[PDB]
Design an enzyme around this catalytic site. Structure first.
Site, PDB file in Angstrom:
ATOM      1  N   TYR A   1      -8.912   9.444   5.601  1.00 45.85           N
ATOM      2  CA  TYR A   1      -7.694   9.971   4.991  1.00 45.85           C
ATOM      3  C   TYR A   1      -7.838  11.448   4.673  1.00 45.85           C
ATOM      4  O   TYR A   1      -6.844  12.153   4.486  1.00 45.85           O
ATOM      5  CB  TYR A   1      -7.378   9.235   3.693  1.00 45.85           C
ATOM      6  CG  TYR A   1      -6.927   7.820   3.887  1.00 45.85           C
ATOM      7  CD1 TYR A   1      -7.839   6.777   3.913  1.00 45.85           C
ATOM      8  CD2 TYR A   1      -5.579   7.522   4.019  1.00 45.85           C
ATOM      9  CE1 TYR A   1      -7.419   5.472   4.063  1.00 45.85           C
ATOM     10  CE2 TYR A   1      -5.145   6.221   4.167  1.00 45.85           C
ATOM     11  CZ  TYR A   1      -6.066   5.197   4.189  1.00 45.85           C
ATOM     12  OH  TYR A   1      -5.628   3.894   4.323  1.00 45.85           O
TER      13      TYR A   1
ATOM     14  N   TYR B   1      -1.804  -0.292  10.485  1.00 49.69           N
ATOM     15  CA  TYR B   1      -2.025  -0.688   9.104  1.00 49.69           C
ATOM     16  C   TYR B   1      -0.795  -0.376   8.254  1.00 49.69           C
ATOM     17  O   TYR B   1      -0.328  -1.223   7.492  1.00 49.69           O
ATOM     18  CB  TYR B   1      -3.252   0.011   8.539  1.00 49.69           C
ATOM     19  CG  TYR B   1      -3.519  -0.309   7.088  1.00 49.69           C
ATOM     20  CD1 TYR B   1      -4.007  -1.554   6.706  1.00 49.69           C
ATOM     21  CD2 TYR B   1      -3.293   0.639   6.098  1.00 49.69           C
ATOM     22  CE1 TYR B   1      -4.264  -1.844   5.381  1.00 49.69           C
ATOM     23  CE2 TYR B   1      -3.547   0.360   4.776  1.00 49.69           C
ATOM     24  CZ  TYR B   1      -4.030  -0.880   4.423  1.00 49.69           C
ATOM     25  OH  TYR B   1      -4.272  -1.145   3.102  1.00 49.69           O
TER      26      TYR B   1
ATOM     27  N   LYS C   1       1.820  -3.138   6.073  1.00 43.06           N
ATOM     28  CA  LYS C   1       2.081  -3.037   4.647  1.00 43.06           C
ATOM     29  C   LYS C   1       3.565  -2.727   4.407  1.00 43.06           C
ATOM     30  O   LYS C   1       4.155  -3.175   3.425  1.00 43.06           O
ATOM     31  CB  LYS C   1       1.195  -1.953   4.036  1.00 43.06           C
ATOM     32  CG  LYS C   1      -0.275  -2.274   4.099  1.00 43.06           C
ATOM     33  CD  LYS C   1      -0.540  -3.643   3.497  1.00 43.06           C
ATOM     34  CE  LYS C   1      -1.995  -3.826   3.113  1.00 43.06           C
ATOM     35  NZ  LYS C   1      -2.220  -5.135   2.438  1.00 43.06           N
TER      36      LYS C   1
ATOM     37  N   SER D   1       0.815  -1.208   0.000  1.00 45.72           N
ATOM     38  CA  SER D   1       0.000   0.000   0.000  1.00 45.72           C
ATOM     39  C   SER D   1       0.848   1.257   0.000  1.00 45.72           C
ATOM     40  O   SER D   1       2.001   1.237   0.414  1.00 45.72           O
ATOM     41  CB  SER D   1      -0.915   0.018   1.215  1.00 45.72           C
ATOM     42  OG  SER D   1      -1.590   1.257   1.306  1.00 45.72           O
TER      43      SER D   1
HETATM   44  N1  NDP Z   1      -8.903  -0.173  -1.499  1.00 50.02           N
HETATM   45  C1  NDP Z   1      -7.776   0.535  -1.458  1.00 50.02           C
HETATM   46  O1  NDP Z   1      -7.782   1.761  -1.484  1.00 50.02           O
HETATM   47  C2  NDP Z   1      -6.446  -0.225  -1.294  1.00 50.02           C
HETATM   48  C3  NDP Z   1      -6.357  -1.568  -0.929  1.00 50.02           C
HETATM   49  N2  NDP Z   1      -5.100  -2.141  -0.651  1.00 50.02           N
HETATM   50  C4  NDP Z   1      -4.940  -3.556  -0.334  1.00 50.02           C
HETATM   51  O2  NDP Z   1      -5.459  -4.346  -1.415  1.00 50.02           O
HETATM   52  C5  NDP Z   1      -6.098  -5.502  -0.842  1.00 50.02           C
HETATM   53  C6  NDP Z   1      -7.561  -5.593  -1.210  1.00 50.02           C
HETATM   54  O3  NDP Z   1      -8.223  -4.391  -0.820  1.00 50.02           O
HETATM   55  P1  NDP Z   1      -9.765  -4.164  -1.223  1.00 50.02           P
HETATM   56  O4  NDP Z   1     -10.193  -5.054  -2.334  1.00 50.02           O
HETATM   57  O5  NDP Z   1      -9.989  -2.700  -1.259  1.00 50.02           O
HETATM   58  O6  NDP Z   1     -10.525  -4.757   0.072  1.00 50.02           O
HETATM   59  P2  NDP Z   1     -12.036  -5.126   0.488  1.00 50.02           P
HETATM   60  O7  NDP Z   1     -12.332  -4.463   1.789  1.00 50.02           O
HETATM   61  O8  NDP Z   1     -12.924  -4.863  -0.675  1.00 50.02           O
HETATM   62  O9  NDP Z   1     -11.889  -6.711   0.807  1.00 50.02           O
HETATM   63  C7  NDP Z   1     -11.062  -7.512  -0.063  1.00 50.02           C
HETATM   64  C8  NDP Z   1     -10.873  -8.922   0.352  1.00 50.02           C
HETATM   65  O10 NDP Z   1      -9.947  -9.300   1.367  1.00 50.02           O
HETATM   66  C9  NDP Z   1     -10.434 -10.462   2.033  1.00 50.02           C
HETATM   67  N3  NDP Z   1     -10.036 -10.981   3.227  1.00 50.02           N
HETATM   68  C10 NDP Z   1     -10.136 -10.409   4.427  1.00 50.02           C
HETATM   69  N4  NDP Z   1      -9.827 -11.302   5.374  1.00 50.02           N
HETATM   70  C11 NDP Z   1      -9.555 -12.415   4.713  1.00 50.02           C
HETATM   71  C12 NDP Z   1      -9.104 -13.603   5.268  1.00 50.02           C
HETATM   72  N5  NDP Z   1      -9.064 -13.812   6.581  1.00 50.02           N
HETATM   73  N6  NDP Z   1      -8.796 -14.581   4.388  1.00 50.02           N
HETATM   74  C13 NDP Z   1      -8.938 -14.425   3.068  1.00 50.02           C
HETATM   75  N7  NDP Z   1      -9.385 -13.276   2.550  1.00 50.02           N
HETATM   76  C14 NDP Z   1      -9.682 -12.247   3.364  1.00 50.02           C
HETATM   77  C15 NDP Z   1     -11.928 -10.453   1.799  1.00 50.02           C
HETATM   78  O11 NDP Z   1     -12.466 -11.806   1.823  1.00 50.02           O
HETATM   79  P3  NDP Z   1     -13.993 -12.097   2.244  1.00 50.02           P
HETATM   80  O12 NDP Z   1     -14.718 -10.884   1.790  1.00 50.02           O
HETATM   81  O13 NDP Z   1     -14.271 -13.311   1.459  1.00 50.02           O
HETATM   82  O14 NDP Z   1     -13.852 -12.309   3.707  1.00 50.02           O
HETATM   83  C16 NDP Z   1     -12.018  -9.889   0.400  1.00 50.02           C
HETATM   84  O15 NDP Z   1     -12.168 -10.875  -0.414  1.00 50.02           O
HETATM   85  C17 NDP Z   1      -5.923  -5.379   0.654  1.00 50.02           C
HETATM   86  O16 NDP Z   1      -4.770  -6.127   1.061  1.00 50.02           O
HETATM   87  C18 NDP Z   1      -5.755  -3.889   0.879  1.00 50.02           C
HETATM   88  O17 NDP Z   1      -5.076  -3.603   2.095  1.00 50.02           O
HETATM   89  C19 NDP Z   1      -3.931  -1.397  -0.739  1.00 50.02           C
HETATM   90  C20 NDP Z   1      -4.026  -0.064  -1.120  1.00 50.02           C
HETATM   91  C21 NDP Z   1      -5.269   0.507  -1.396  1.00 50.02           C
HETATM   92  C1  BEA Z   2      -9.130   2.670   1.418  1.00 48.73           C
HETATM   93  C2  BEA Z   2      -8.292   3.876   0.979  1.00 48.73           C
HETATM   94  C3  BEA Z   2      -8.923   5.071   0.565  1.00 48.73           C
HETATM   95  C4  BEA Z   2      -8.183   6.201   0.157  1.00 48.73           C
HETATM   96  C5  BEA Z   2      -6.783   6.173   0.151  1.00 48.73           C
HETATM   97  C6  BEA Z   2      -6.151   4.979   0.562  1.00 48.73           C
HETATM   98  S1  BEA Z   2      -4.392   4.772   0.609  1.00 48.73           S
HETATM   99  C7  BEA Z   2      -4.759   3.130   1.197  1.00 48.73           C
HETATM  100  N1  BEA Z   2      -4.014   2.169   1.528  1.00 48.73           N
HETATM  101  N2  BEA Z   2      -4.933   1.143   1.901  1.00 48.73           N
HETATM  102  C8  BEA Z   2      -6.079   1.670   1.757  1.00 48.73           C
HETATM  103  N3  BEA Z   2      -6.009   2.884   1.305  1.00 48.73           N
HETATM  104  C9  BEA Z   2      -6.884   3.866   0.965  1.00 48.73           C
END
Ligand code: NDP
Ligand code: BEA
Ligand code: NDP
Ligand code: NDP
Ligand code: NDP
Ligand code: BEA
Ligand code: BEA
Ligand code: BEA
Lengths: 270, 270, 270, 270
Positions: free
Chosen positions: B210, B165, B169, B151
């Site tokens: 944020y 968090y 990461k 992230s």
């Molecule tokens: N959205 C953003 O802005 C950003 C996201 N990220 C990273 O990218 C990844 C996905 O984020 P995003 O899609 O937004 O997240 P969501 O909140 O939309 O959830 C994504 C997923 O992660 C899963 N997950 C959580 N716990 C488990 C677990 N115990 N085992 C297996 N799967 C699990 C959920 O599974 P289920 O729903 O089936 O439990 C789901 O499928 C994360 O690692 C996040 O930190 C990084 C930067 C930015």
């Molecule tokens: C969820 C999210 C929103 C806006 C900016 C960021 S920067 C980051 N890193 N994990 C999650 N996020 C976000």
């Protein structure tokens, strides 16, 4: 605008500051407490197992002209940390500097890492430091100093079989950036010192794991390698090298240095 | 010397590759599996709770012309990960690409972090990814691809109440450097994608945390802020933005890119 | 929100794009133009002295199925750059991608650097790239791509007698961060590729200057060192390795990657 | 192994050291010479145009109890630098510390940068520092200290119309890494201080160029912005903030800190 603190050498004075150093019975930590004391600090040496060494250090600091005391606590146990700070504050009345030093090493190819050994390292190296940092915040004087112990391995590019340890130290660098924002409400500066191979018990135990084909190296051969391969300055780093930088960050001189990672290697490349 | 792989567009082909994406029922992960499939990949969608969504994704990939299947596993439980890979391999016979996507967010001033919430985040975000990475190594084809989810917060300098968090990461970036050495014995490349604010359920849940004084922002106002404050390109990032880069790393094109952190933000500064 | 570009393999297509590659008569640049063309690009090969080689490359690209043309210009002369772009645009009508490749190496202890040799390197490596970048901005299509050539030496920690060259490449990484903001008003993405030792004429000329005590190394011995010491993947990097990543950045896939430095080494540590 | 230098406060002593500070008639440089002198250093203040200010500073240092002298030289002219050092050495007999401070700012969208303005900035900021560094090497005492002046803009991600200046400072960070290897044969440590917005003439001249829509800001409004937007510590940085860190690097305490970039911002994010 107003000048922050005295002008001149007086800005490097640690006289009248109370500091807490975790894992100060030996290694880099012992020297950190020793040096902090030499600069006029009251040191509280924390220890986990090395009671004898701990007490020895406390005697030394007093013999040098400063007051010190020691507290026992296992950084891998949040309740111990909470207690350590409650006692710490009562000992000398206040807490100005905290040096999160304690840590453990580990080596192994990724494929051989067990959940038990992963949790072993992360629990002390990463989780422990967070909670020590959390408690430091609550008890530190406005304008206090929090210094986290990292490592060259957090950014190293060529150390094999070292993911668990490297990852635990890497996270510490991120902690510094974020903690520097939250903890700023009390004017506390947060920084990470990142040493790169210091002669301590750890060095004696695992240095060869860093040297390609070093099982055979004799002690002097290890130092020769360390001195030549890891520094243009051609010498092995000593705990005093870290201790000196730690005093800088803890003084008025480090007031505008926060959220940073100070690499303390002889210009090493790992 | 010999050229590694075909010359021309054929080097970007993922056709005939079997990939495993953790947490592929929604968010970025869902799109990662979708896009991987569109480029001719057989996708195994892992899920923890979103069964419905999971199945829906599997139907979609097939409807698009690729084979897919889904496996249930909680990345916070090492036994589940171990099982997930043993089944995964039998489904399509082999495993070429692994995308460690699953993760959770958290916000709070340092002083309010509880050991329970610290372990909650680190167990999925950091520990889970390590063990997914460990198992990926054991089951990946020689020349396979391991992609870890990081992230922008791993390096961000201005996000308050975000140490837990951010630290989870940050450690992932270090894992990439070290794992790239160990896992190279099987020609596997390890890299970290570091997104920076993507419209997903997470975004809907915590984006306002944020934005300085954003409790009041309406959904469209949040997107306006995101688009303008976080990117010179003036637009909000979408899962497809990450999915496209992930396909690059997974293809022959990414063969010489290993041990790196690819920041996928619109040139954001956080 | 709206999806930026097509979903699927079509997002990696460079078909119908016009690209300009500086210093494309040989080395990495030649391969950059070749590969760009193989992916359906019309390539304009710039050259300074290697006319023969230049023409040869143009013949090759056509033989492969794409149109190409060559333009002569000395990047160390701002007027030449200005002219090169005015002609470039008229050749195929538009300009979508620009690859600032041209560069020169240099070695020497700090104490032996002369103002003449410092200006020699900086004028081509740094100043030239800025003005090529400046002109690229003015002539690039909205949504165009600017790719700057950097080097592993921009961040390396152990290369002796290499300050002038390393500094010229280091500044390029900063240019990328800043140019990504200004040039975003035309939706142009700016990124820096940072190779780490590629077999080209340069490699043949100065590789030994990187190998401690390598005056004696035979050609095959140099490659053996390069392959083993500089990459866990155990092989020497080739121009095609950079060319493949350059195509990724130039395509729709790289739309959300801007202001970044993509290190293209086999996981090297220098 | 042998301890490098004295234990205790005596390790922070600069007493009996001769230092040369370029551009010491005003701004950060003036304070650098002042503070260095307060810690017992003999300061040689270099200047280009500010003769009056220069002399004034020399009077001040003496009035404070240290000896000082001033030398005129235009860092953009290699012959001037060569001469400055030949005279410098004869003044107090030796040279222990060199602080390459002089520099100039510049703002403008890439498209408006002229070769003349590019060379103007790079010639002083980058080329000048290299040759000052080169001469420092030749004249520095074994164990001397070379400190280069960089800037937060070398790594900043959100400053628009700032490529030329940012690039000139970025290259300085690379110079530090490489120079630390070559110059180590004389035990000289090389480091880069990277300030982040200090109240000086420069600040008065161009601070508004950093503040989005700041043409209208009154002086106090600028400081309010600077204090709040650029630091969790909520205050504007002063020259003394840099001067204090410079003394640390110049002392025995900085002996194991070499090839590094010390960011001296109040935890700023630009
Ligand atoms: N959205 C953003 O802005 C950003 C996201 N990220 C990273 O990218 C990844 C996905 O984020 P995003 O899609 O937004 O997240 P969501 O909140 O939309 O959830 C994504 C997923 O992660 C899963 N997950 C959580 N716990 C488990 C677990 N115990 N085992 C297996 N799967 C699990 C959920 O599974 P289920 O729903 O089936 O439990 C789901 O499928 C994360 O690692 C996040 O930190 C990084 C930067 C930015
Ligand atoms: C969820 C999210 C929103 C806006 C900016 C960021 S920067 C980051 N890193 N994990 C999650 N996020 C976000
Ligand atoms: N040596 C080196 O080359 C480098 C060291 N470091 C880091 O610096 C720190 C100190 O290293 P070094 O002095 O070499 O280490 P040592 O192996 O010499 O041990 C140092 C100390 O850490 C302590 N410690 C371990 N577990 C605990 C615990 N559960 N609670 C409290 N204290 C504990 C030990 O306490 P006790 O003995 O009382 O149990 C001891 O006091 C570590 O964090 C290390 O990772 C970083 C880079 C380089
Ligand atoms: N080889 C390696 O290991 C690495 C190379 N790089 C960088 O990649 C780029 C290409 O390197 P590589 O192909 O190995 O180099 P080569 O030594 O093979 O030469 C490449 C080219 O640069 C050109 N060039 C030099 N001066 C000019 C000029 N004044 N105007 C226009 N073009 C000029 C040459 O043009 P002509 O021959 O027509 O004069 C030629 O076309 C360089 O910027 C280099 O620094 C970075 C990392 C590693
Ligand atoms: N102010 C800030 O916010 C920051 C400043 N910096 C850097 O710190 C350094 C000092 O900045 P600051 O004090 O604010 O600057 P000022 O604008 O106050 O000017 C400082 C000095 O640089 C000198 N200088 C300019 N050209 C020459 C030259 N040709 N030869 C010798 N000296 C010269 C001036 O000399 P004279 O007046 O005698 O001509 C003067 O002494 C610079 O390198 C700057 O880029 C970095 C980050 C922040
Ligand atoms: C113990 C040790 C020896 C040599 C080099 C290093 S680099 C590092 N980081 N933690 C420990 N170490 C060592
Ligand atoms: C020419 C070369 C050979 C080996 C390693 C490197 S690293 C780098 N950067 N520019 C050129 N090179 C080389
Ligand atoms: C002059 C200045 C004002 C505010 C912020 C910065 S950051 C930087 N770097 N060089 C100069 N500056 C400034």
């Amino acid at each position: 605008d107003a000048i922050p603190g005295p002008l001149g050498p007086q800005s490097a004075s640690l006289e009248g500051k109370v500091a807490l150093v975790t894992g100060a019975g030996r290694g880099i930590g012992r020297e950190m407490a020793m040096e902090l004391g030499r600069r006029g600090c009251k040191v509280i040496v924390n220890y986990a197992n090395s009671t004898e060494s701990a007490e020895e250090v406390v005697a030394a600091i007093k013999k040098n002209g400063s007051d010190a005391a020691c507290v026992k606590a296992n950084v891998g146990v949040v309740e111990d940390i909470v207690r350590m700070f409650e006692e710490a504050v009562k000992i000398f009345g206040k807490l100005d500097i905290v040096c999160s030093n304690s840590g453990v090493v580990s080596f192994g190819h990724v494929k051989d890492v067990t959940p038990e050994e992963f949790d072993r390292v992360f629990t002390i190296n990463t989780r422990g430091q967070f909670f020590v940092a959390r408690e430091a915040y609550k008890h530190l004087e406005i304008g206090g100093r929090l210094i986290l112990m990292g490592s060259i391995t957090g950014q190293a590019k060529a150390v094999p079989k070292h993911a668990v340890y490297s990852g635990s130290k890497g996270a510490i660098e991120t902690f510094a950036r974020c903690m520097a924002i939250d903890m700023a409400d009390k004017k506390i500066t947060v920084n990470v010192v990142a040493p790169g191979g210091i002669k301590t018990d750890m060095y004696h135990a695992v240095c060869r794991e860093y040297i390609p084909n070093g099982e055979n190296l004799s002690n002097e051969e290890v130092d020769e390698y360390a001195a030549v391969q890891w520094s243009p300055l051609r010498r092995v780093g000593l705990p005093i090298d870290i201790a000196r930088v730690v005093c800088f960050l803890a003084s008025n001189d480090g007031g505008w240095v926060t959220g940073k990672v100070i690499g303390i290697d002889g210009g090493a490349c790992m």
